[PDB]
């Protein structure tokens, strides 16, 4: 009452599919502009906010 | 092939036993002298040491 | 075989769709998608190992949803 | 019943004995023993909950060592 | 003898992009030899919850950084907050 | 036809201080209704390992603080390092 993962034809699961095997540009950043990571204050702030978000759920 | 936890006489498991129900002085600090917690450097150092301890085990 | 797990492109679009109802107009660094994909895959592969242990405990070779459920509960998920 | 779990005094002596082969001449703040005892008890009580889940998974009401073992493995212990 | 107006429905499909082959591939890597039919659905639900929790936190980081581009580091912190360790990013 | 000198043995007993009643009390609190006989031994082993790991780290903290008295905070850090959260200390 289940299906075998290992046997003849499992190799079809591993074929290369070029059009699916890379990320596309859509949804990615539009350019190479510098992106600043969180400052320690900004991080501490975000976690404070999420702490409270959770506290009310 | 096992024993029941809940039934007549489980109450004997909860009786007070004064001589066992408190910590004794032996092994405890001898006096009320001030005890300084780890400095951030000391903590970072200890964790560095334990990281390496683990890395060799 | 290959180190192939989840196809990249559907994974990307999956991430954008989910992100969209939290916030709109978002874009991603490719590495951010990469980060999500690797973590997702490590998460599921590890989970399947725990799941497999739960099946064996029940003297089954076939894993089932209840196995995944036990694993997640013990791992402290909700 | 009572909130009694492990008797304090044997727990204290248990801690000193274990501590002794790491380092000698150690003494403890009482709160440190208290800290160890509470953590130990939370740890075991929680573990028994996971263990109980593993027994039920195997359609048993009686928990067994193999249940504790499964729980610990899934929790990532060694 | 009248008639009815059914509910408009809104579809979010993309989780089906975690396909049966993808799921077999994950399970195999996890050492699994045999799966029940319900495993596919279950796995999609589980991953969906996982991503929803991590991306929600990540997006929250991105906002507090006052920008609209999500970064690998935003995801790393989110993962850490959600109890998962990621190296290399 | 000769004779033998057996090995001297060194006993560390104190783990037996986690008694059968103590273990019943823990299991009950954990919602457990029935235990096999081997549960007692197993639980002692498991706790012993746990304490050994936490106290080893704690003692290491105490050393780096250049003192011979272990403090509640030393234990808290040890617990945190060993993946356990403790409040109130």
């Amino acid at each position: 009452d289940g299906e075998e993962l290992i046997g003849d034809g499992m190799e079809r699961d591993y074929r290369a599919i070029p059009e699916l095997d890379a990320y596309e540009a859509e949804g990615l950043a539009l350019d190479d502009e510098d992106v600043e990571e969180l400052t320690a204050s900004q991080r501490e702030a975000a976690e404070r906010a999420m702490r409270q978000r959770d506290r009310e759920a | 092939d096992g024993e029941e936890l809940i039934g007549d006489g489980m109450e004997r498991d909860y009786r007070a036993i004064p001589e066992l129900d408190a910590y004794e002085a032996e092994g405890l600090a001898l006096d009320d002298e001030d005890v300084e917690e780890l400095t951030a450097s000391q903590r970072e150092a200890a964790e560095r040491a334990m990281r390496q301890r683990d890395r060799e085990a | 075989s290959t180190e192939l797990l989840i196809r990249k492109l559907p994974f990307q679009r999956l991430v954008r769709e989910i992100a969209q109802d939290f916030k709109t107009d978002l874009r991603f660094q490719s590495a951010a998608i990469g980060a999500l994909q690797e973590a997702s895959e490590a998460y599921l592969v590890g989970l399947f190992e725990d799941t497999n242990l739960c099946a064996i405990h029940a003297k089954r070779v076939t894993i089932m949803p209840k196995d995944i459920q036990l694993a997640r509960r013990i791992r402290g998920e909700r | 019943s009572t909130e009694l779990l492990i008797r304090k005094l044997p727990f204290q002596r248990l801690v000193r004995e274990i501590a002794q082969d790491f380092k000698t001449d150690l003494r403890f703040q009482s709160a440190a023993i208290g800290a160890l005892q509470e953590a130990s008890e939370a740890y075991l009580v929680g573990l028994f909950e996971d263990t109980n889940l593993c027994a039920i998974h195997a359609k048993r009401v009686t928990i067994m060592p193999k249940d504790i073992q499964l729980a610990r493995r899934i929790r990532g212990e060694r | 003898k009248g008639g009815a107006k059914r509910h408009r429905k809104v579809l979010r499909d993309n989780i089906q992009g975690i396909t049966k082959p993808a799921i077999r591939r994950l399970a195999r890597r996890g050492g699994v030899k045999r799966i029940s039919g319900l495993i596919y659905e279950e796995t999609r639900g589980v991953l969906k919850v996982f991503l929803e929790n991590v991306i929600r936190d990540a997006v929250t980081y991105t906002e507090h950084a006052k920008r609209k581009t999500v970064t690998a580091m935003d995801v790393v912190y989110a993962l850490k907050r959600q109890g998962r360790t990621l190296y290399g990013f | 036809k000769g004779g033998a000198k057996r090995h001297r043995k060194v006993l560390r007993d104190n783990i037996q201080g986690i008694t059968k009643p103590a273990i019943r009390r823990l299991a009950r609190r954990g919602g457990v209704k029935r235990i096999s006989g081997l549960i007692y031994e197993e639980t002692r082993g498991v706790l012993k390992v746990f304490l050994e790991n936490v106290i080893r780290d704690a003692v290491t903290y105490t050393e780096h603080a250049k003192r011979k008295t272990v403090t509640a905070m030393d234990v808290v850090y040890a617990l945190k390092r060993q993946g356990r959260t403790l409040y109130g200390f």
Partner: protein, 149 residues
């Protein structure tokens, strides 16, 4: 914990009172659900029940909760359960919703009001209605009109 859905945002409770399984709805409601969960369009399990009714399903439902007056989730055009039931001409269900609560002033703003909704329903189905149906609609029509007062 309890809220995880299909790709339409539909909770396990939804599916039961959608397909109108009473032995399911019952068993599930036992432990079952935080109510007023909104699927991706914004409906609630009571909307589904009213919309399809499933009279004896909505009776089980309106019991617990209550949840009996639920507005629209955005995008679903702000349709209350009575609005929904009057769109589907389930009058026995519309009658049920009037006991245990009612919105009747709701004026749900698709541009219309509860009476206007029924009236537009009648207008659209004018031919094809039974005698009994025509009468259930008249009762309901005079009943709503005399609600606002």
């Amino acid at each position: 914990k309890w809220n995880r859905r299909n790709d339409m945002g539909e909770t396990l409770l939804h599916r039961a009172c959608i397909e109108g399984q009473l032995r399911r709805v019952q068993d599930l409601v036992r432990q079952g659900h935080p109510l007023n969960p909104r699927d991706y369009c914004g409906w609630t399990p009571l909307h589904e029940a009213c919309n399809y009714g499933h009279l004896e399903i909505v009776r089980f439902l309106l019991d617990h909760g209550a949840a009996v007056d639920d507005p629209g989730g955005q995008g679903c055009e702000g349709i209350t359960p009575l609005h929904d039931a009057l769109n589907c001409g389930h009058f026995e269900v519309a009658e049920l919703l009037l006991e245990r609560g009612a919105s009747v002033t709701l004026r749900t703003r698709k541009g219309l009001s509860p009476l206007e909704t029924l009236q537009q329903w009648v207008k659209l189905y004018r031919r094809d209605l039974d005698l009994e149906t025509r009468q259930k609609a008249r009762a309901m029509e005079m009943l709503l009109q005399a609600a606002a007062s």
